C-alpha cells in the first residue's frame with residue numbers, strides 16, 4: 001500500500017483541484033470516545049512530535065486526517081497550505097490550533113470540515129489516523145444546544161465507512177458500561193470486524209478497583225480484544241516528559257500491577273501499534289479488490305472524456321486547469337492500477 | 342419542617358404498599374447520574390452508618406425510597422418486612438441486596454419496583470431520599486439491548502414530578518460536559534429551579550488538573566450551584582474505614598487543596614446536607630397549598646372508590662384485603678390533611 005500512497009495522493013489532489021474531492025475510501029483509523037477519554041494522546045504516540053493538541057476540557061474540535069508516510073527526511077504539509085513545506089513542528093501545532101479556530105468560528109464549538117495533514121518522517125509507520133472530538137452530553141460556553149448530536153454526526157461520517165477502522169477509546173476510571181465509544185462501535189460495526197478496544201487512564205483507577213474483566217475481554221467481548229495503555233498525565237505533559245519515559249512507566253505499570261501482570265505482554269502502547277498495523281494490513285489486503293474496481297471505473301469514465309480532446313493548439317497562454325487536472329487524474333489512475341495488482 | 346413528615350411518610354407507605362405512587366407528588370430528593378458516579382455513597386452519608394450497597398460495576402438496581410426521620414433511637418423498618426425492626430445496619434445493607442436479588446437476579450438486570458426503607462435516628466434530618474441506578478450506554482452480562490432506556494425511564498418517573506428535588510451527581514474525574522446527570526436535569530428542569538449539583542471523586546483527578554472552574558459555578562452555571570464531596574474509595578471500604586473518618590479526610594482535603602481552599606466553607610458532605618435540607622424546606626413551603634389541593638382531591642377519589650368497590654363486591658359481608666388497602670389510603674389522607682391546616 002505504501003507503494004500506491006504516492007498515486008492516491010496525486011489522485012485526491014487532482015480531484016480537489018477541480019472541486020470534486022473523490023471518495024477513495026482509503027483504509028484509515030479513527031478514534032472514537034467520550035470527551036477527554038485520551039484519544040489524541042493515543043494518536044500522538046504514532047508521531048511523537050507534540051503537535052497534537054491534548055488536554056482536559058474540549059480541545060480537539062475538528063477531525064484531523066493525519067497521513068503518516070515513512071520517508072528519509074522529516075516534514076509536514078497541510079492540504080490548505082498547498083506549496084508549503086513545514087519543518088518546524090511547533091509551527092505545525094500552531095497551525096492546527098489556528099485552523100481549528102478559523103473554521104469552527106467559535107470558542108468551544110466544533111466543525112466537521114477536516115484538517116488534512118501529511119507527515120513524512122523516518123520514524124513513522126505508513127498509515128492514516130483520524131483524530132476526532134470526543135462525545136458529550138451537555139453544552140458549555142458558546143456551544144450550540146445540540147452539541148452532543150453535532151459531535152456524534154461528525155464521528156459518524158467517518159465510522160460508517162467500511163474502510164475506517166475504529167479505535168474505541170474508553171477511560172478506565174469510568175465503568176465500561178458508560179462507554180460512548182463502545183455504544184457507537186456496536187451501532188456501526190455490530191460484528192466487531194473493525195473495532196479495537198483501547199482502555200486508557202489505567203493509572204487513574206480508584207484504589208481497590210481494576211479493569212481485569214475488561215482487559216481479559218470478558219465484560220464486553222470484542223473480536224479484536226482490548227489493549228490497555230497508560231499515557232502522560234497533564235502534569236507530565238506540562239512537565240515535558242517524553243514518550244520514551246512515558247513508555248518505560250507504562251511497561252512498569254503493567255509488569256507490577258497484581259491484576260494485569262499475567263497480561264502484560266499483550267498490553268501497552270507498543271503492543272497497540274503492532275496490533276493496529278496488523279489489523280490495518282489485513283483490512284487493506286481483503287479490501288484491495290474494492291479499491292481496484294473503484295479506480296478501474298473512474299479510469300474508464302475519464303478515458304471517455306480524454307478520448308474527445310485536442311485542448312490547446314495555440315501558443316503558450318490559453319490556460320486550461322481543468323484539462324490539466326483531468327490529465328493528472330488520468331495518468332495517476334493508470335499508474336495506480338499498474339501497482340494495484 | 343412542621344413535622345408533617347410522619348404524616349407524609351404514612352401516606353406514602355399507604356400508596357407504596359399497592360404500587361400506586363403514580364397518584365402522588367410528595368416532596369423528596371432523587372439522585373441522578375451515570376453508573377458508579379457515587380450516588381449511593383452520597384445518600385448513605387445522610388445517615389452516617391454503612392447500610393447502602395455500594396461499589397464499581399452496577400450495584401443499585403432498583404429504586405430505594407428512603408424516609409429519614411429524626412428520633413431518639415436508631416433503627417430501620419422495610420415496608421416489605423412487616424413488623425420487623427433492624428438495628429444492625431449491616432443487616433439493613435444485606436436486606437437491600439437480598440431484596441434486590443429477589444427481583445432482579447444476580448445477572449445485572451434492573452427493576453423499577455421500589456424498595457421502601459425508613460430509618461429513625463437522632464442524627465438525621467427529616468426528609469425522603471430516592472436512590473436510583475445510574476445511567477449507562479452499553480448493556481453487559483444479561484442486560485437487555487435497551488438497558489439505557491429502561492434505566493432512564495425508571496428515574497424519569499421520579500424526576501418529572503414537580504415536588505421532586507434533583508440531586509445531579511457528576512464524578513470529578515470525567516469532564517463535566519460528559520455528565521448524564523446534568524443532561525437529564527436540564528431536560529426536566531431547564532431553569533434549574535429544583536436541581537442541586539454535586540461533584541464527587543475530587544480526590545481521583547489526574548495530577549496537574551483540578552475542578553476549580555466547575556466548583557466556582559463558572560464552567561456550567563447552575564442556578565443552585567455545585568458542592569464537592571470526597572467519599573470513600575473501594576480500598577477504604579475494604580479496609581473498614583468508617584464515615585466519621587471519611588468526613589475528617591474530606592474536610593482536610595478542601596482546606597489543603599491550593600485550588601479549593603477559598604471555597605472550603607461551601608464544600609463538603611455536611612454542607613451539602615445543610616443545603617439540600619434548606620432547598621427542600623424552601624420548596625415544600627412553596628408547594629404546600631398545591632399539595633393540600635391534591636390530597637383533598639385524592640381523598641374524594643378514594644371515598645368514591647370505596648363506594649364503588651362495595652358494588653363490585655356486594656360481599657358475603659366479610660372483609661377482603663382490597664377494602665383494607667383502600668381504607669389505609671383514606672385514613673392516611675385524612676390525617677395528613679388535618680396537619681396541613
Ligand SMILES: Nc1nc2c(ncn2[C@@H]2O[C@H](COP(=O)(O)OP(=O)(O)O)[C@@H](O)[C@H]2O)c(=O)[nH]1
Pocket residue numbers: 034035036037038039040041042053054055056059060134200201202203204229230231232233234235237547548
Ligand atoms: N494519568 C493519565 N492521564 C491521561 C491519560 N491519557 C490522557 N490523559 C490526560 O487526559 C487529558 C485528555 O487527553 P486528550 O488526549 O486530550 O483526550 P481527547 O480529548 O480524548 O483527545 C489530558 O490532560 C491528558 O494528559 C492516561 O492514560 N493517564
Ligand SMILES: Nc1nc2c(ncn2[C@@H]2O[C@H](COP(=O)(O)OP(=O)(O)O)[C@@H](O)[C@H]2O)c(=O)[nH]1
Pocket residue numbers: 206207375376377378379380381382383394395396397400401475541542543544545570571572573574575578
Ligand atoms: N475515591 C473515591 N471513590 C469514590 C467516591 N465516591 C464514590 N467512590 C467509589 O465509587 C464506587 C461507586 O460508588 P457508589 O456510591 O456505589 O455509586 P453509585 O453506583 O452511583 O451509587 C465505589 O467503589 C465507591 O467507593 C469518591 O469521592 N472518591
Ligand code: ALF
Pocket residue numbers: 034035036037039040055056057058059060061132133134135
Ligand atoms: F479534546 Al477531546 F475529546 F476532549 F479531543
Ligand code: ALF
Pocket residue numbers: 375376377378380381395396397398399400401402473474475476
Ligand atoms: F451501583 Al450504581 F449507579 F452503578 F448505584
Ligand SMILES: [Mg+2]
Pocket residue numbers: 039040041053054059060131132133134
Ligand atoms: Mg483530542
Ligand SMILES: [Mg+2]
Pocket residue numbers: 380381382394395400401472473474475
Ligand atoms: Mg448506587
Ligand code: NA
Pocket residue numbers: 035036037054055056057058059060
Ligand atoms: Na479534552
Ligand code: NA
Pocket residue numbers: 376377378395396397398399400401
Ligand atoms: Na456502581
